[PDB]
Design a protein around this ligand. Structure first.
Ligand SMILES: Cc1nnc(NC(=O)c2cccc([C@H]3C[C@@H]3NC3CCC3)c2)s1
Lengths: 665, 133
């Protein structure tokens, strides 16, 4: 709370200056700690001001007026700070009524490839800065991977659905700016097996904790044992889950061995002691005979004959003393063996039923990373997990489509315009686009710089859907093959009667086999309308795209039928099934840190490209090709907010190169 | 520093299950068989020990003798002395046995007795005879 709340809400340390700011304000950071604290307050304040009302522009004067002394003494510093915030989209970003209207004459021409959230964010920002922006769209609609199905009152995102927490999330700002029906997620998810019978609390809780214990395990393997390379190859996350389940399965067996080996160690102490008891009884048996024979000689007897009866009597009671000591000991061993037979260790690490339910927890992981766990980097798959926003993840009730559509208000957006060639030279760029409907109609666009928000899957496409002239340097193309672009699809089931538990937003289905763990393994009730939404994660994703809507819808009813009874499952009125890998404007769903990749590859993706000099011997030129999109932001990948932040980011960096950065003096 | 609890991730075990593609199911069934071996072995001794139990049926109740409760005396009758020399001859120095045999004199008297009746009963000569066996 306070000014400091605004720094946290802007992803920024309230009491330290970022590497960003050191760049623009090296006088301050290298200077006395007092000025830093001033600066920091001025920043933190200004952020606040924007945040408390993000529907109107925050002009520099407005800022100064509300700022108080002694902080409002150095107008240059305040002006310096406010421009910096404005340039890099920390303030006056999104959709705001501007006080001072746009300068009528623009400076510079920038072509943006793709009207996705990264694209529009940059576009809005650049226009905002007085630049001539034009976005080229292959699709007939904006939002790219923010897709929303609409028919009558039916509404369901084929694309993003979830706003991950408003603590420090730029979407928090956007939602105040565009009315967004933000409904929370009730985390409670009941799991239903193949039979259609719910898994009992005992079981659900006991397998979920194993699952987390298993992750915590892979992390331990990765960091403390450095199990990251195996057979000259990077270790996948899935690889190491096998190796951890196997090692826990080995321990189960180990402890059964050690426990029965402790029965044999005691049964054999018994068998050896039984032997002594049986040999002593025979010895006793014959002693008795000797004593009775000696006792048979009736008195009066001479002393050697008296000594013999006494000697035999003494000896025999001596042996009867041994055999009594040795049967107290037999009682102890008999009970000790009895304990061991009753405290047998766990029969199995996990049952077939148990491990089928475990799979559904791996399907969740596969759906979060939109990829088989065998492709995730062990070391790095969760590298973005420190920057999680606080707060509970929400869903958009009126569809996520409204954000994108709201960002396009007032932008030159050419739809049905497929870029096919990007040509960039020392003197400027030209992009070649066709009209998607009749591929022959051809367009040429000239510009000072191109911002590329082509999805990573499009960029991966061989043979190239878009060729770059000159080709991208290998350092870029390599980071593109290295990185992973994965898949998850959705099935939208539209029904007239809500026939599920309306107080649970989401509920699972446990797949029959491991290889089919993600086939429709999770269902969502998010909407005021009666729509259940079925996810296809992991391997299932790529496979179900080769199968019909009907066949896919069938398996949907079936599962629904099983969990609710053939009776209450009406025929779905409208069916939509996404096929994102098939889509050529995405060729995937979102990025994931592939094994052998790292978070540095995202950094690579975002470094822009500077072409060679036209005339040899001419001075090193300006960079002309920039990259945005969810695959460029290393700390917030595969998310709508990450995309958006990357658009804001490039816009400021493009503005700094072509409008000049006056806030550095 | 250390794994979650119950997880048993030795540094040395991972290599063993990572050494080859089928190495995992190797070690895992190498123990599946070894467990069977012990189980087999458990049945056996359980039988062998069960057989021995049967033999010990009746315990030793029939071969037991009632205990004599005779008040220890301190006078040595000519008889008791004679019981003694024999007990030494067959026990040598087991003080308790000799006291048990006479069953009226005690270990102190018995122990004293060797030095009292010493040249008289040639105990040293006797004791050598006991040590011969
Ligand atoms: C309760 C819960 N808390 N968080 C939940 N969901 C997610 O974190 C989530 C779900 C789907 C996709 C992603 C993608 C951003 C993630 N890229 C990978 C996976 C983390 C690094 C995250 S479940």
């Amino acid at each position: 709370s306070g000014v400091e709340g605004a720094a946290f809400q802007s992803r920024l340390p309230h009491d330290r200056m970022t590497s960003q700011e050191a760049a623009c304000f090296p006088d301050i950071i290298s200077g006395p700690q007092q000025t830093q604290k001033v600066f920091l307050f001025i920043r933190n304040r200004t952020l606040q001001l924007w945040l408390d009302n993000p529907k109107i522009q925050l002009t520099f004067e407005a800022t100064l007026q509300q700022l108080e002394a002694p902080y409002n003494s150095d107008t240059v510093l305040v002006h310096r700070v406010h421009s910096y915030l404005e340039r890099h989209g920390l303030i006056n970003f999104g959709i705001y009524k501007r006080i001072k209207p746009l300068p009528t004459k623009k400076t510079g021409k920038v072509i943006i490839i793709g009207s996705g959230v990264s694209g529009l964010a940059a576009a809005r920002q650049l226009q905002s800065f007085g630049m001539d922006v034009t976005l080229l769209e292959a699709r007939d609609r904006v939002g790219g991977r923010v897709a929303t199905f609409r028919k009558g009152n039916y509404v369901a995102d084929l694309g993003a659905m979830v706003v991950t927490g408003l603590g420090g999330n730029p979407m928090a700002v956007v939602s105040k700016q565009v009315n967004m029906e933000l409904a929370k997620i009730k985390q409670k998810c009941p799991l239903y097996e193949a039979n259609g019978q719910a898994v009992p609390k005992e079981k659900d809780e006991m397998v979920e904790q194993e699952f987390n214990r298993l992750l915590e395990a892979t992390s331990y393997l990765s960091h403390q044992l450095d199990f990251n390379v195996l057979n000259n190859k990077p270790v996948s996350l899935g690889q190491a889950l096998e190796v951890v389940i196997q090692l826990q399965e080995k321990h189960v067996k180990d402890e059964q061995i050690e426990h029965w080996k402790k029965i044999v160690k005691t049964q054999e102490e018994l068998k050896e002691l039984l032997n002594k008891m049986v040999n002593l009884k025979e010895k006793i048996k014959e002693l008795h005979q000797q004593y009775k024979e000696a006792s048979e000689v009736k008195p009066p007897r001479d002393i050697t004959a008296e000594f013999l009866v006494k000697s035999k009597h003494r000896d025999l009671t001596a042996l009867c003393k041994e055999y009594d000591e040795l049967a107290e000991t037999q009682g102890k061993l008999e009970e000790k063996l009895q304990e061991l037979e009753a405290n047998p260790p766990s029969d199995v690490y996990l049952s077939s039923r148990d491990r089928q339910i475990l799979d559904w927890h791996f399907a969740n992981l596969e759906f979060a990373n939109a990829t088989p766990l065998s492709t995730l980097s062990l070391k790095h798959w969760d590298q973005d997990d420190d920057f999680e926003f606080t707060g509970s993840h929400l869903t958009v009730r009126n569809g996520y489509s409204c954000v994108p559509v709201a960002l396009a208000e007032g932008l030159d957006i050419k739809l049905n315009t497929a870029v096919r060639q990007v040509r960039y030279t020392a003197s400027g760029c030209e992009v070649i686009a066709v009209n998607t409907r009749s591929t022959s109609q051809t367009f040429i666009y000239k510009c000072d710089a191109v911002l590329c928000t082509l999805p990573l899957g499009v960029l991966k496409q061989q043979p190239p859907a878009v060729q770059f002239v000159p080709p991208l340097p290998e350092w870029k193309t390599s980071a593109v093959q290295r990185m992973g672009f994965g898949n998850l699809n959705k099935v939208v089931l539209c029904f007239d009667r809500v026939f599920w538990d309306p107080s649970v937003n989401l509920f699972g289905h446990v797949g029959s086999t491991t290889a089919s763990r993600g086939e429709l393994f999770l269902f969502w009730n998010l909407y005021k309308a009666p729509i259940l939404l079925a996810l296809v994660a992991g391997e299932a994703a790529g496979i179900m795209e080769n199968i019909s809507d009907d066949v896919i819808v069938g398996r949907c009813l079936a599962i629904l039928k099983g969990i609710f009874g053939s009776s209450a499952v009406p025929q779905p009125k409208e069916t939509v099934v996404s096929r994102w890998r098939a889509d050529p404007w995405a060729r995937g769903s979102y990025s994931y840190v592939a094994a052998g990749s790292s978070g540095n590859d995202y950094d690579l993706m975002a470094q822009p490209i500077t072409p060679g000099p036209s005339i040899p011997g001419a001075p090193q030129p300006i960079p002309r090709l920039f990259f945005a999109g969810e695959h460029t932001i290393r700390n917030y990948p595969a998310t709508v907010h990450g995309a958006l932040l990357s658009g804001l980011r490039e816009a400021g960096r493009i503005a700094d190169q072509f409008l000049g950065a006056m806030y550095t003096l | 520093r250390k794994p979650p609890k119950g997880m048993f991730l030795s540094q040395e075990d991972v290599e063993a299950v990572s050494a080859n593609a089928t190495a995992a199911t190797t070690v895992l069934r190498q123990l599946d068989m070894e467990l069977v071996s012990v189980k087999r072995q458990i049945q056996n001794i359980k039988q062998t020990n069960s057989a021995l139990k049967e033999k010990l049926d009746g315990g030793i109740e029939p071969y037991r003798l009632p205990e004599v409760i005779q008040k220890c005396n301190a006078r040595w009758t000519t008889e008791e002395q004679l019981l003694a020399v024999q007990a030494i001859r067959k026990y040598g120095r087991d003080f308790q046995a000799i006291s048990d045999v006479i069953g009226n004199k005690s270990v102190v008297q018995v122990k004293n007795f060797f030095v009292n009746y010493r040249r008289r009963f040639n105990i040293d000569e006797v004791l050598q005879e006991w040590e011969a066996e």
